[PDB]
Write a protein that binds this ligand. Structure first.
Ligand SMILES: CCCCCCCCCC(=O)OC[C@H](COP(=O)([O-])OCCN)OC(=O)CCCCCCCCC
Ligand SMILES: CCCN(CCC)S(=O)(=O)c1ccc(C(=O)O)cc1
Lengths: 488, 165, 95
């Protein structure tokens, strides 16, 4: 029986999702004796293959109910393992972790999409001995001193498969946890192996974009008044073709990412800025063929965006690529809040200084007063007792009021930013850079919109046991003195 | 070694009578006085402060400089291209210098009356100012987050190593 | 016998340096009973003067394997001292 009404569905209100079935309730409430009874009573045994209204099996239900705390996750890991070990008795021919819900997700793929690092790490690295060895995803090949060599099973994991765990973490997962998931084994060595095969394609793509931005600059400089002339025309055609090429390449990106489009740009803001630079490059050449002089401010905007977009490629090296992650932060969220306070001050004082500076015994218009009042924040204030104005003492008191209120506001704003951002949290920039390299790899593996690359398959087909049990395994070698010495 | 090479080179260029001896003599005069800060290690108070002050800032400013120079050059080629049409910014050097003056507080931010695209030139300056001051705010907060950690001050011992060397 | 192939050398990849000798392995794996047996069995006593391919003795091997953590360093200090104290029995003229 499925408890399927809105109280039992997963949503932001008052609810309790446990799956929908008696067996999934008994698992999520941590009742082995009830789970054992429901599974192996003679009257009506609970099928481990049974699914709720979302298609979730009890293993998807346990992944939905995992929280990344040590008390929940350790007990969900035990509940998951004993149900999987009971599946090997009760359903011996059935691969319970190959059962897909209505989103096409297995329990491992669902743990990646929902960002559940603790149960994800456990499933991904799972190892057993004796009867349950085929339920492993990790097989130790040999161990010697501080060194372990392990084969990891890549079945749902390698990006050779469509809708794989790597594609999910990069493009379908919403969570803060994505950068912690790409730095787990085997994913860390597997993404390094892919990156090493593609780093020459990454820097070729950068060198083409440097040559395009050199030509863009040499043609935006050397514009005529509004052999050198035919080379200028060639430069405009190369910019049109580079602008159409980038416009088609980014429309293909957003077409492929359509179902999860916000997830595919929330951190990856350059995928919008390359589309915008390409649109403005095509629009500026179109306005130039129309001969309208508004082509030049579009060409110059797409030249600025063109060089700002060159900062995308700083992720290719650890030192620049981690710093591009250290620098950009929570400041973008709070400056957009401070800007509302700063613009009510700036406009409120601008309409006032304009109204009062109108009478004779700067400040000529709302734009000019907004600009003179804005110059106080760049240190160019021009603060003076204006001799010709009738109300010159009140105009000076309005400037002294604006200065004091604005510098109190900037002092409040800097101290508010320090209070949230200088917290001592250990720096998570290396792992956010590893996720930027993962997103870059998983895009490069498709080739280009015009030349769609045939994907190479990672690891080797190896016999790990008797199901024989032959799997695409990937060999990781770990050296760990600090963990090993504690076992001596 | 550099101050000594430039001192020998500047006297060699002076014996050659080439007027480029003077900018080498003046560079080796600057380095000459900067090198006088070596001897601050002879006393505990100046010698520990020479160790408090120099730090991880030299590593991260060389990373920020790549971001700042892509902004500065990207906006300089743009303001030069757009300020070319009549109804500052005469060359890549002059626009790089006018845009650099915004970081020393000497910005000269204005609605230029004679330029055809003067509103777009002002919007390009307001875009550069806002992006650069967001970048400097990100850079200062990034530096505080690594360098204000509460680690107990290891300057007395780094000064003892300077005295050992 | 010297375990001297690249897995046993010290480098930035996958490796396990212990010196290269049975006695240096027994010391770095913290096995006094094996260290005592290798040093003072009657069949073939391990020379405390014996060296790997870098010329490292067991005392250089223990210095290579020290980490500045309190658990590693305290146990390396005990392993180093007992080998040095055994050198005063087994190699009494040798510094
Ligand atoms: C259609 C058939 C003809 C194909 C011609 C060759 C295409 C090469 C494509 C390539 O190198 O693109 C690099 C860059 C986009 O970078 P990105 O997709 O990695 O990252 C995008 C951001 N996510 O895009 C560019 O630099 C623009 C390409 C045009 C300029 C080529 C200059 C060549 C100089 C040697
Ligand atoms: C490829 C050689 C591997 N070796 C260690 C490297 C020197 S090994 O000593 O042969 C060995 C060690 C341990 C195990 C095991 O734990 O199953 C098996 C083999």
């Amino acid at each position: 029986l499925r408890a399927c009404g809105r109280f039992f569905q997963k949503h932001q209100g008052t609810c309790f999702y446990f799956g929908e079935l008696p067996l999934s309730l008994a698992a999520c409430t941590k009742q082995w004796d009830v789970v054992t009874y429901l599974l192996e009573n003679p009257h009506q045994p609970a099928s481990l293959e049974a699914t709720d209204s979302l298609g979730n099996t009890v293993l998807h239900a346990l992944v939905m109910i995992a929280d990344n705390s040590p008390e929940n996750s350790a007990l969900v890991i035990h509940m998951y393992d004993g149900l999987l070990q009971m599946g090997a008795r009760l359903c011996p021919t059935v691969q319970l972790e190959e059962i897909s819900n209505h989103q096409g997700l297995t329990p491992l793929k669902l743990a990646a999409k929902e960002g559940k690092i603790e149960i994800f790490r456990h499933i991904l690295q799972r190892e057993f001995s004796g009867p349950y060895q085929p339920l492993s995803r990790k097989f130790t090949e040999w161990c010697y001193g501080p060194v372990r060599v392990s084969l990891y099973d890549l079945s749902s994991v390698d990006s050779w498969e469509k809708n794989s765990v790597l594609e999910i973490i990069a493009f379908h997962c919403k969570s803060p946890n994505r950068h912690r998931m790409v730095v787990l084994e085997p994913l860390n060595k597997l993404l390094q192996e892919k990156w090493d095969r593609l780093v020459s394609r990454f820097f070729f793509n950068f060198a083409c974009y440097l040559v395009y931005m050199f030509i863009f600059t040499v043609v935006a400089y050397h514009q005529p008044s509004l052999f050198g002339e035919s080379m200028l025309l060639l430069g405009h055609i190369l910019i049109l073709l580079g602008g159409i090429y980038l416009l088609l390449g980014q429309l293909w990106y957003f077409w492929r990412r359509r179902l999860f489009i916000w997830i595919s740009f929330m951190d990856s803001y350059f995928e919008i800025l390359f589309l915008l630079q390409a649109l403005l490059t095509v629009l500026s050449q179109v306005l130039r063929f129309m001969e309208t002089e508004w082509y030049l401010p579009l060409l110059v905007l797409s030249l600025v965006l063109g060089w700002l977009n060159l900062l995308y490629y700083t992720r290719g090296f650890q030192h620049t690529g981690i710093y591009s992650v250290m620098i950009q932060k929570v400041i973008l969220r709070d400056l957009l809040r401070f800007l509302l306070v700063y613009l009510v001050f700036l406009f409120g004082f601008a309409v006032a200084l304009v109204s009062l500076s109108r009478e004779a015994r700067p400040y000529r218009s709302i734009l000019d007063a907004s600009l003179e009042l804005f110059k106080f924040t760049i240190g160019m204030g021009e603060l003076a007792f204006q001799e010709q104005l009738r109300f010159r003492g009140v105009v000076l008191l309005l400037l002294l009021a604006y200065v004091l209120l604005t510098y109190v506001l900037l002092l409040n704003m800097l101290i508010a930013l320090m209070s949230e951002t200088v917290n001592h949290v250990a720096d998570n920039s290396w792992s956010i850079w590893k996720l930027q390299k993962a997103i870059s790899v998983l895009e490069m593996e498709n080739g280009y919109w015009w030349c769609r690359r045939k994907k190479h398959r990672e690891g080797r087909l190896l016999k790990v046991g008797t199901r024989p049990d032959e799997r695409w395994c990937f060999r990781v070698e770990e050296v760990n003195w600090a963990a090993w010495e504690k076992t001596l």
